[PDB]
Amino acid sequence: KEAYHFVLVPEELDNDYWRLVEKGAKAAAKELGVDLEYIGPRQANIDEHLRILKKAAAAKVDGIITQGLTEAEFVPVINEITDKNIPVVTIDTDAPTSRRVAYVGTDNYYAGFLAGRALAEDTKGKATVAIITGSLTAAHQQLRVRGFEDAVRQEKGIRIVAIEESHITRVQAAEKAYTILKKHPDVNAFYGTSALDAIGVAKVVEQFHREQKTYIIGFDTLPETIRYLQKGTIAATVVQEPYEMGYKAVKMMAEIVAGKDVPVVTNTETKVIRKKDLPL
Prior knowledge:
- It is built from nine helices and twelve strands.
- By secondary structure, the chain is α/β, with parallel strands linked by helices.
- It folds into two domains: 1-106, no CATH class; 107-280, Response regulator (Rossmann fold, 3-Layer(aba) Sandwich), CATH 3.40.50.
- It has a six-stranded parallel beta sheet, sandwiched between helices. Strands 7-6-8-9-10-12 form a six-stranded mixed beta sheet, with helices on both faces.
- Helix 1 packs parallel to helix 9 and helix 2 runs parallel beside helix 3 (71-82).
- The longest helix has 17 residues, at 16-32.
- The termini are far apart.
- It is classed as sugar binding protein.
- The entry lists the keywords Glucose-galactose binding protein, Gebacillus stearothermophilus, three-component sensing system, galactan utilization system., sugar binding protein.
- It forms a monomeric assembly.
């Protein structure tokens, strides 16, 4: 009996969030006697991401765990991998129209919906919102935006005046905040859907001395996010369970190759945390 060899491809190797996924994935792998190879782009890059997927598939590994990041490029690659009878578990971002066997990650539509609810609650239903999103093509970003929009649609005192892409860098989130605040000086609320968006926004808001008049809600728990939350510049952030999705993704791949029944979608929890919830 040879050990199962699984590949987990993170969006970015050196990233606090994915290192938490790696920890959970390696904990489950060790617990099951599974060889887990954790490889991806050192810096997020779609083309090296796809290239590492197709390489792992050509190695006849027993299963591949990955984001279904974009419909256009990742659904074909997931299906291509599935056509070699290698099962794919999606993690963090689903591709529900692909032939991936199972998904483990946040309900991204509903993370954004809870963010809309939290913004409406905290602003007492009155806000002029700008949205910073990592990209318009990444499936989880799209869902987080759409969920927020649906949540606030009937909030008569809320209107969304801008949506801008950060390309998941802190510097470009700041850039877009400079552009938005210049163009829409009535903006008193920012919603960021990737891990550095609120952080980039927070810097610009503080530069213009607008923190006391600006509500900021972002995603995840990076150190600068916790700092701005303790300081008051960021009012809230949506917290995921990267360790748990790493752990559950590996355990579910093992169930799949063992022939057991597994659900198609497993959603790890999501929570809107504010300053009062710190420490985590």
